[PDB]
Amino acid sequence: GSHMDDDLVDAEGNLVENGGTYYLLPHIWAHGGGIETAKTGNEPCPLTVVRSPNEVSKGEPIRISSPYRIRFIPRGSLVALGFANPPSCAASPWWTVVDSPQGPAVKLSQQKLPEKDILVFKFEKVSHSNIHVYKLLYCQHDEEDVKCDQYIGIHRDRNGNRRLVVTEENPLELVLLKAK
């Protein structure tokens, strides 16, 4: 069963488009907003991917991209995630996971990255009727194959920056909203 039911769908009931721009909206009980950036510690600019604490904000427009020449994004297929309008200090728009003092965290980079470093995300369906909710998987470089066994979660820090990090116990759930 291939199924059209396998492609990602946005909050409006429309197929998620490769290269399209979307807002990533946490689907959990804690109030807040979409995903955006923030400057933490060292960083000379916002290189830390975080969930907005503001509730009226849908966060930053984000591109969901598959290198392959497909119009729609199938679940379980690898994708790169990035900001369509990243901080002037970021080399590229793409998110990447780097081990931080607090553990594997989602950040932007000041140096261009190879394909293998950005194609590390995958959306996993959470069963709901009428709506489409997903969990976000992270898949390190298991050499040549792929290996999605870790999820992305939120780790509130000292200042209250809701940082996106790799979590083994508490994954985020998200809905995708087409950024017009």
Between strands 62-65 and 21-26, the pairing is antiparallel
Cα atoms found within 13 Å of the Cα of residue 156, Cβ hemisphere only: 5
| 130 interacts with a copy of itself by CB under 8 A | yes
Give dist(CA 80, CA 106) in Å, integer: 12
| 27 interacts with a copy of itself by CB under 8 A | yes
Q: Enumerate residues 6+ apart whose C-beta is below 8 A from 104.
A: 97, 98, 138, 150, 165, 166
| 61 interacts with a copy of itself by CB under 8 A | no
178: which 2 tokens? 């087409």
| 32 interacts with Cl ion by CB under 5 A | yes
Give dist(CA 74, CA 31) in Å, integer: 29
Give dist(CA 179, CA 172) in Å, integer: 20
Residue with tokens 């081990």: 99
Give dist(CA 166, CA 138) in Å, integer: 7
Q: Which is nearer to a copy of itself, 26 or 86 (CB)?
A: 26
Of positions 34, 61, 74, 82, contacts a copy of itself by CB under 8 A: 34
169 binds, among a copy of itself, Cl ion, none (CB under 5 to 8 A by kind): a copy of itself
Q: Which is nearer to Cl ion, 30 or 98 (CB)?
A: 30
| 26 interacts with Cl ion by CB under 5 A | yes
Stretch that binds Cl ion, among 60-68, 72-80, 129-137, 160-168 (CB under 5 A): 160-168
In the complex, the smallest distance separating the C-beta of residue 137 from a copy of itself, rounded to whole angstroms, is 13
| 110 interacts with a copy of itself by CB under 8 A | no
In the complex, the smallest distance separating the C-beta of residue 61 from Cl ion, rounded to whole angstroms, is 18
| 162 interacts with Cl ion by CB under 5 A | yes
DSSP-assigned letter for residue 17: B
Binding site for a copy of itself (CB under 8 A): 25-30, 33-34, 55-58, 126, 130-131, 133, 135, 156, 169-173
